[PDB]
Ligand binder design. Structure first.
Ligand SMILES: O=c1ccn([C@@H]2O[C@H](COP(=O)(O)OP(=O)(O)NP(=O)(O)O)[C@@H](O)[C@H]2O)c(=O)[nH]1
Ligand SMILES: O=c1ccn([C@@H]2O[C@H](COP(=O)(O)OP(=O)(O)NP(=O)(O)O)[C@@H](O)[C@H]2O)c(=O)[nH]1
Ligand SMILES: [Mg+2]
Ligand SMILES: [Mg+2]
Ligand SMILES: [Mg+2]
Ligand SMILES: [Mg+2]
Lengths: 376, 379, 376, 379
């Protein structure tokens, strides 16, 4: 049936995303020395200050301040005229804290309870829903043209939102686009709107989806000079829908950034994405949602549901069987299936954990095996 | 299907309750205040930050300690003490270049304060029109009023987590296939006497639903000793339980957190309105399950999208539903506030045991169902 | 006997003095609404952040953030290139907390124990010791030429130190001068030294005391661009010797800033200065040190010692008698004798609480009465 | 004359002990580390900030909690708990544009790291050559080792303050004219039984000095109930007891704080050397009372001033003393370090009950007195 669906994203400069990146920069720094470290790093950014807290247990020795300043600096906050300066902001630290419980580590019980969802759809090339996919690309393009000097008056903080029109489960076009970007005093709003349209929006959104009825809200309130942590708190794990599927799929409720792979909240979400994407990549369904749940201390998932919204190209009972045959969804089994014990997570902390074809859980190395195990 | 909840002693929930305690305190004096209160709780301290624009004069430390006493932290043995903990505040005033004054001759036409997407959901699986798993997870952890009325004080400590795994045949509840209840306790009780008291003293609200067949896996303290909890050895932030606050995974979510936000923040008020729309659609008999998505663009009063999903359970053409909602509900940001009468200090009660399913809240009223049913042409 | 004596001072931009000024700016803001408020405000300034804490009890409603930013801004830290920005630094608050115990408030017992010292000497016009006096004037002159644009490349943080040569208890000249000033990248060290000599040192130090043997250490280590809270913590009450007599006199050990006048640690120190200065101003002695001590809950001082280092012009027993006849040294008696219940204390928090002739405890309105009560 | 001291339970002293605990921990691994550790203690939290340049890897929280346990805060009833309090750190690394490497072919010729003035003092009023009032104020509050060895645990809480008021005739001790001892206590003792136990159980170190004539005013808990103390309801910062740390008001002070500073900070090492010079002058019989002032200019190795004050008690021309000190002591910043053997983790013990008067410290040695007396030509 005809309907609209909307998703949003934010740039690496949005204060919530700043916190997520700092949390995963600390995780990456620790994993490079202690691949098996336990990390639960919560970050809280506000005017003038970064607070890094949580609980950690590792043999690694890390400089929290240096990691934090480097991260903020890469994001681009390097001057008080931007509202935040990586070189002079305060950095505060408030981090704290059986061994071989299984003969086979792959049989360790879940370190926590919870349910996670994976999703895939052949709407886009990356098998992600269209709204979240192009919302990410808009804020990522904003950062791209900000850093390479194409538009030097841009500033780090920005938000996007895309409203897609669907009909009979197929995409007809784009109904509304929102893009709010921080900027310096130099540029006027008229010049800003045209440059964002020409350098950010038009190069990213397929023209076939842009009709005369599409609304374009470019800095709808106008002046956007004060941004980032100034005038807006940022906390880790406050963008979990931006991080996953933009609302197209359900969500178990767990945040990703700041957590080592032993947190099923994170790695099982990655594994769920890995199965759903391989099912859709194998031609076994157009759209596929995977629900997995874990009981603490239990290795086998307490539930595995495969929903294909009537788009399955083989019986539903055979899909759920293939999922069990080709994927190891035990907490520490999926860690090895995805090779998650490496410092690869700072890159996930902005622009979406799902959609980019270089992360382990985005590989489709099992798609050909799945359709072979089903016929075609 | 599986869904989980947490108690008022959980650190994340502590942060929500503090943020809404601060909000409620401000609304008592300035019902039109702008509040964005973000709370951080860690071993030994509370940090309350954010931005507020109000004429009210409140006491953040006093509000914070009172919130923590009620939750039941008044001694260092529990791992946290509301009387001796540290309370830091980092709250700024009016963010420059925002409040442009009147702006609109009709205040109901004001633009939204931010972009964003919100979801509402209703299902006639229960007399409160909520999804089954999440609904009784709250009532489970909420029966800790026994430890306040001295019904049974014993050994239980606040921090708790529930998980119920149902299974469906044709969208109908088959039964309970797995119950996970992990609770913090004291040293004055063993894991054997614990798991027996846990499986017995959780039945008074859980109803005579003997859905626990011979194939229902129970996990009461499956890991073992659970003595240290709360902020001690675990960090809590507001807005880190948004799936617990809403529909426990059954319905989708837009990502916005509720606590610490005044009603002019669409992230909260529009989620409430979405629940108000879906519950009234179901209550009116126009559908058995209903999910609503709204979205806003900053500075725009009209929602940029409205989607009504009935999952094939509608009793009237779906396009008709979308039109009924557009006219029978005022989904403009400041029309929601008037439609729900939201400018009141009612939000601390929400930050604890679910924002939906408790029918004394304005967005739980089904005062439009009959009107909707009449306009829909049924009967 | 011949000897050298040295004292130091710091500018309003030195991080310890930043904390003192913030503490007394909060005190002033409270006293303007609640003259009888109880204030004990401790401030802690570091890279990017100001922490204001302590214990207060008042009917006043004050905006700690606004008071703090205004204070830092007046000091001059307004840009991340200076290492600190009043507009974007973090401000954290950690403030907490019988009535009519006496029929006559003047008889209330001391709110705390302690001993305090006052000092006066006719060496200088303001009846202060020479070293501390001119150390203050150097850093105060540094700030004066920084703000009025005479030397716009100066920055707020600076330190001074003057070594005086004494002989037979009389001043012969100045043996060494140290002046370290923060500055921007623009100025080179050679140009900086000459400008500090011409605009700061020479206009302040009497030429009769500057001989060819006087050492001048102007930015002895050279480059001084990073200053203020960056690279150096500041805490309230860490300059108590700069605040009093530069070491020429003994010190009871109590800090001034952040305390309301009910803290004998502060107001009794002021009263002691008031008596010593009036004794010297009356011609009753060349140099005079006053020691007073208080027992908690006791109104009358538990000791009053008057030391005149052999310079007394009347018998010692008569000086101590005159002190008791003309000065009310009870805790709440000296408050009324000096009219201390007004927001006058932010001005004391840099450049010395003693020496400036507009504070109440620097008035010599009793000098003529003292010498009349003794003859001449 | 009057002088006061405080115990290791006083919040300011807690901050000093933490700063030197951190310093000592670093020196154990890097004896040449640069440390400037500033500690803030408030109800429920410790904030450890400053700057350090070291190759050592320490644990600030672990060091902090251990320091607070020893002081005796392990339960929320005392107002503070070392196991549940918050510990924040804000410690930066090498301040840019400072360490220029070698700089000098003879390391003893390095310039001072900062300007500043320092005082030392010695008097033969006591076998430790310290002023009377302050010397036994420390030993008073230090006898709280009874509450550690279970000698007498009872009701006393850490926070305590002493004050003794002597009087002089011709520089000779006449007697005690006023004793003020206010101590924090528990609810398991009244102010009557308190003041009796306070006046009786403080005599074991106070010696048979019955200087308490009929005119000696005693003030034991003169205000009354003293139950809440420590960081609870009172703020503590390092370097806020510098007169207690030194000579209790008898001698003058340069303003620099000791704790949290490594020996290359003249604010500490030169104050120690000043005490070393004065004590050796008195011990050698060259004077009965001696006060020394030194000062430094940043980047200059030679003190910018040295003043010897004998208060008329010298037994040799005063100008000769100033010359003897210049040659028999190396008062250059890095010569002090070698002269006193300061690159060792010995500083936490100083942050508690006075930096001077305890003869096992390097700066309390009188190993030059005889040499000084020989060079002075006496006997
Ligand atoms: O109560 C029960 C629950 C499950 N079972 C059976 O356990 C079987 C599952 O075996 P398994 O977990 O070892 O298979 P798996 O592929 O998931 N193993 P891996 O994850 O690839 O390592 C099921 O066939 C189920 O019928 C019972 O017999 N009784
Ligand atoms: O034990 C004692 C101590 C003091 N005294 C006497 O109290 C007298 C002090 O009186 P006072 O305190 O009222 O005089 P004052 O000028 O200080 N009063 P004010 O501070 O100006 O209000 C002294 O003369 C002293 O001899 C005793 O008789 N016995
Ligand atoms: Mg926020
Ligand atoms: Mg949002
Ligand atoms: Mg410092
Ligand atoms: Mg100093």
């Amino acid at each position: 049936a005809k309907h609209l669906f909307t998703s949003e994203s934010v740039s690496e400069g949005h204060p919530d995303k700043i916190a997520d990146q700092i949390s995963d920069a600390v995780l990456d720094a620790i994993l490079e020395q202690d691949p098996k470290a336990r990390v639960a790093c919560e970050t809280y950014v506000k005017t003038g200050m970064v607070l890094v807290g949580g609980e950690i247990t590792t043999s690694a020795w890390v400089d929290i301040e240096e990691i934090t300043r480097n991260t903020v600096r890469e994001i681009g906050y390097v001057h008080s005229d931007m509202g935040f300066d990586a070189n002079s902001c305060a950095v505060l630290s408030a981090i704290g804290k059986q061994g071989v419980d299984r003969a086979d580590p792959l049989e360790q019980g879940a370190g926590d309870q919870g349910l996670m969802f994976g999703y895939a759809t052949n709407e886009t090339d990356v098998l992600m829903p269209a709204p979240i996919t192009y919302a990410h690309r808009l804020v990522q393009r904003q950062a791209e043209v900000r850093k390479n000097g194409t538009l030097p008056w841009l500033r780090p903080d920005a938000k996007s939102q895309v409203t897609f029109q669907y009909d009979d489960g197929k995409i007809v076009g784009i109904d509304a686009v929102v893009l709010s970007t921080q900027h310096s005093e130099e540029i006027d709003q008229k010049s800003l709107q045209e440059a964002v349209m020409e350098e950010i929006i038009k190069p990213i959104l397929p023209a076939e989806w842009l009709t005369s009825a599409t609304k374009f809200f470019i800095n709808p309130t106008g002046r956007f000079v004060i941004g980032g942590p100034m005038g807006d708190c940022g906390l880790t794990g406050r963008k979990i829908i931006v991080d996953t599927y933009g609302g197209m799929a359900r969500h178990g409720g767990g945040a990703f950034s700041g957590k080592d792979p032993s947190k099923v909240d994170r790695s099982a979400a990655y594994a769920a994405r890995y199965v759903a994407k391989n099912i859709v990549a194998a031609g076994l369904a157009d759209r596929c949602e995977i629900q997995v749940s874990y009981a603490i201390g239990v290795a086998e998932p307490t539930s595995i549901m495969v929903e294909t919204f009537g788009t399955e190209k083989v019986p539903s009972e055979q899909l759920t069987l293939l999922v069990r045959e080709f994927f190891d969804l035990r907490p520490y089994g999926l860690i090895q299936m995805l090779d998650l014990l490496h410092p690869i997570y700072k890159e996930t902390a902005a622009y979406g954990h799902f959609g980019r074809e270089h992360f382990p859980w985005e590989k489709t190395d099992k798609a050909q095996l799945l359709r072979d195990a089903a016929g075609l």
